[PDB]
Amino acid sequence: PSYLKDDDGRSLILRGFNTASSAKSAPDGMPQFTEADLAREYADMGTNFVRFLISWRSVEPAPGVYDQQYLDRVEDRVGWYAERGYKVMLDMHQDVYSGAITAIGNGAPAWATYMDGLPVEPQPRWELYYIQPGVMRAFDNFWNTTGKHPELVEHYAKAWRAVADRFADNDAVVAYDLMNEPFGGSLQGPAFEAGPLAAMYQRTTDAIRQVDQDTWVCVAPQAIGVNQGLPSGLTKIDDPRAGQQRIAYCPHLYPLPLDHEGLARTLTDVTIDAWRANTAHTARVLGDVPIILGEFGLDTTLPGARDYIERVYGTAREMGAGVSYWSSDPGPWGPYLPDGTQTLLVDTLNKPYPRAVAGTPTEWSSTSDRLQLTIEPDAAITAPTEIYLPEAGFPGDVHVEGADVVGWDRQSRLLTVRTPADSGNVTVTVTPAA
Numbered sequence: 111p112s113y114l115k116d117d118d119g120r121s122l123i124l125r126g127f128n129t130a131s132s133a134k135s136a137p138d139g140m141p142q143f144t145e146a147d148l149a150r151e152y153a154d155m156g157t158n159f160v161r162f163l164i165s166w167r168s169v170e171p172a173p174g175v176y177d178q179q180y181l182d183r184v185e186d187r188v189g190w191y192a193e194r195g196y197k198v199m200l201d202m203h204q205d206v207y208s209g210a211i212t213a214i215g216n217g218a219p220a221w222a223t224y225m226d227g228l229p230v231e232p233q234p235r236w237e238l239y240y241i242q243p244g245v246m247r248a249f250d251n252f253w254n255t256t257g258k259h260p261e262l263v264e265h266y267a268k269a270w271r272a273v274a275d276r277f278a279d280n281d282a283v284v285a286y287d288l289m290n291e292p293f294g295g296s297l298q299g300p301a302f303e304a305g306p307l308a309a310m311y312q313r314t315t316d317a318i319r320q321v322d323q324d325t326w327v328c329v330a331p332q333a334i335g336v337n338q339g340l341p342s343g344l345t346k347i348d349d350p351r352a353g354q355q356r357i358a359y360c361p362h363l364y365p366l367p368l369d370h371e372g373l374a375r376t377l378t379d380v381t382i383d384a385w386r387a388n389t390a391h392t393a394r395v396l397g398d399v400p401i402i403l404g405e406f407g408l409d410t411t412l413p414g415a416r417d418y419i420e421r422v423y424g425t426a427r428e429m430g431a432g433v434s435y436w437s438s439d440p441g442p443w444g445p446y447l448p449d450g451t452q453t454l455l456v457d458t459l460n461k462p463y464p465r466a467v468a469g470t471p472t473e474w475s476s477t478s479d480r481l482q483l484t485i486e487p488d489a490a491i492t493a494p495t496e497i498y499l500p501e502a503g504f505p506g507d508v509h510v511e512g513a514d515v516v517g518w519d520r521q522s523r524l525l526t527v528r529t530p531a532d533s534g535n536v537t538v539t540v541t542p543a544a
């Protein structure tokens with residue numbers, strides 16, 4: 111597997127949440143999420159990553175006019191993450207194109223929404239709005255499948271350029287997820303993904319690279335089908351940056367039976383297997399790129415939920431993938447219920463992990479009171495390997511075999527270690543002090 115890297119050349123293992131669904135329809139475009147909420151998340155789970163929802167409607171409220179005050183608000187939030195050592199992926203988020211389709215959809219500004227008078231009648235489930243005539247036409251106009259709106263993708267790319275211009279020198283921002291859950295309207299499958307989808311990604315990457323050379327550009331397959339374990343027809347995107355390509359692949363995982371026991375468990379288990387095979391293939395097509403599982407999630411009060419969650423994180427670990435759980439929002443899907451009570455997610459996610467490794471992590475494992483990590487060394491890296499250790503399992507000092515302890519911060523829960531770079535692969539084992 112390939113990894114995103116920090117400025118010290120360390121390989122990043124990314125663990126966190128999508129924050130937050132509540133932003134989708136917020137008038138000011140911000141999630142209902144405070145600095146105190148992040149402090150709680152960090153204290154309870156030691157996360158180091160966020161997929162932070164932004165929106166085109168908030169960036170570009172009028173054609174060619176970008177809202178710098180909105181970007182100020184996003185910058186303020188990124189600051190909260192920066193202060194607690196997080197890396198941030200900005201997600202240009204949409205579901206069902208736009209709020210202007212009827213509160214149901216979100217993403218595009220009203221000026222960018224052309225349903226051409228075609229109907230969008232009320233449906234019993236939100237997902238069904240995707241296939242209503244007016245929504246299908248909004249998407250068809252966006253992709254210029256209709257031939258009537260070539261400007262829309264160009265506007266999209268330049269709104270991204272505006273965002274990248276603001277965040278190019280932000281040390282907490284590591285990735286730009288170019289489009290949440292792409293949907294092709296009347297185009298579906300490889301016709302969509304290798305056609306207008308790939309074309310938009312190339313134009314947007316190119317525009318971003320006018321103002322930002324170093325942030326990872328993250329691309330997704332179409333959501334419908336591929337979310338459920340079908341192959342993607344997405345094709346390679348060219349990164350014009352001088353040096354090595356910085357493109358990453360950011361698919362989602364949503365097995366059909368969950369939308370976890372008996373035949374339903376078997377179906378979900380083979381879905382993961384299929385999803386892994388397909389994800390690995392497309393990551394190869396894109397240039398042996400790093401993988402971020404940008405969304406997965408379920409109602410944690412469902413029987414078998416913990417087994418499913420643990421299986422997904424083990425699979426991500428084996429794949430060398432980042433994870434942003436959908437989502438931090440209050441409710442039984444999330445880490446907290448609305449009254450602040452912890453769900454099953456907190457104890458499940460609160461495990462030791464390597465955050466930033468001085469070399470390529472070839473294999474690792476962790477339990478409540480043990481972490482083991484094997485590193486393929488890189489002599490050029492001078493920064494230590496940085497590891498999260500939860501207090502429940504590590505209430506005092508650490509015992510470390512295979513590395514020298516550089517620092518052990520019992521407040522931030524960050525252990526830093528140093529390993530030789532001239533003795534082949536090194537295995538570090540961390541346990542609680544006697």
Ligand SMILES: CN(C)c1ccc(C(=O)NC[C@H]2N[C@H](CO)[C@@H](O)[C@@H]2O)cc1
Pocket residue numbers: 204205237238240241290291293333334337364405
């Ligand atoms: C019919 N189409 C095109 C469709 C249907 C359903 C989803 C979906 O459930 N996606 C999973 C989650 N992703 C969003 C956030 O990106 C969440 O609201 C969904 O639960 C996607 C597309």
Ligand code: NA
Pocket residue numbers: 277278279280281282283284325
């Ligand atoms: Na950055």
